[PDB]
Ligand SMILES: *CC(=O)[C@@H](NC(=O)OCc1ccccc1)[C@@H](C)CC
Ligand SMILES: [Cl-]
């Protein structure tokens with residue numbers, strides 16, 4: 554015989570390891586024995602918080618680990634027949650730069666059926682695929698969706714068709730410890746959750762010059778409107794409702810054209826609901842009430858009466874839809890910022906992660 558079982562120790566890192574990613578906790582496990590002592594400190598001797606399972610078989614760090622750190626791990630395992638100790642030292646990732654993600658809509662919000670998930674970064678993302686792999690989106694009832702990038706810093710996720718009311722969406726951006734390309738690592742994680750509200754779709758038909766608001770299939774409001782003139786027409790397509798303003802100042806000089814010129818004007822506008830990054834609003838237009846419902850006079854915006862503008866402000870929420878049809882203009886760019894739904898699904902599905 555002359556045989557006795559000796560405790561063994563195994564860990565999620567190896568001694569002398571470099572480039573260890575902080576996207577996972579570090580653990581230590583005991584076999585044929587139990588953990589009698591476990592400690593972990595950084596290069597400065599500062600300890601790391603951990604937790605020991607009741608059976609004493611598993612120890613794991615409970616706080617996220619830092620970059621450019623050198624950690625030292627000590628662990629002793631005692632058993633019915635022997636003991637074993639190990640000291641392991643490893644070096645974590647050394648980023649060249651960090652990037653902080655920003656997600657919308659906000660946590661706990663109720664949004665319309667056109668609202669996509671948006672993850673915006675504060676730096677360029679050289680490895681879009683890694684960014685997509687690190688973003689976990691849960692839908693209930695489950696529905697298919699896909700990623701698509703609007704620029705080098707913001708990516709969007711949405712299903713093929715408009716959301717179904719009552720759908721719960723949970724977004725987990727787990728980019729901490731992930732190399733997003735060229736040494737660009739995630740500064741932190743993000744966790745937001747939102748819900749899909751009632752179906753609200755408003756249709757602006759250039760043939761009738763009417764903006765018709767439908768709530769769950771029923772017409773509830775019919776607004777005379779004056780859209781962009783033949784020289785600066787309103788583009789057809791689908792618009793996602795964005796920010797809403799009791800009032801907002803629309804410049805002109807911000808576009809490079811001086812106000813004191815033929816095609817420039819400065820004005821403060823009431824009851825303005827943004828529906829494109831390019832500057833298209835549903836807003837109060839006292840000056841064109843006579844034209845509304847007849848002819849187009851704006852620069853692109855959907856002019857309506859003051860009372861209808863305030864109504865739109867009060868009855869529309871972020872994510873609702875505005876559809877423009879039968880105008881002399883082209884189609885709203887798919888990567889406008891609020892024109893996601895104008896990209897054919899097959900082109901969106903395929904993505905552009907390269
Ligand atoms: C309301 C509009 O039609 C414009 N939107 C905007 O943001 O204001 C810019 C502006 C341009 C010229 C004079 C005054 C303000 C259009 C540019 C939106 C297509
Ligand atoms: Cl106007």
Ligand code: NA
Nearest residue numbers: 595596623625
């Ligand atoms: Na050290």
